[PDB]
Design a protein around this nucleic acid. Structure first.
Length: 49
DNA sequence: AAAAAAAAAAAAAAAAAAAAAAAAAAAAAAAAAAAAAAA
């Protein structure tokens, strides 16, 4: 809202629920995505293959 | 005319900034165990 851009609430609440799903702060880095419980090929496709 | 030493050609060889997590070392209070004084 500083730049006057409007994004719908669902697309923001989905991200806010993705980060707070595990009970702590799951950042969107290589330290939060690669520390999840997903598959090996999914995690190696992003960073630190 | 046959045998040996030095020079030159051919072939193999080795020489940038940011940010987060983990490891480490000095410190520091706490707690359990051992030695000494007194009743």
């Amino acid at each position: 809202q500083f730049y006057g851009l409007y994004v719908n609430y669902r697309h923001l609440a989905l991200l806010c629920d993705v980060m707070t799903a595990k009970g702590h702060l799951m950042a969107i880095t290589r330290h939060g995505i690669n520390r999840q419980d997903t598959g090996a090929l999914m995690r190696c496709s992003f960073e630190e293959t």
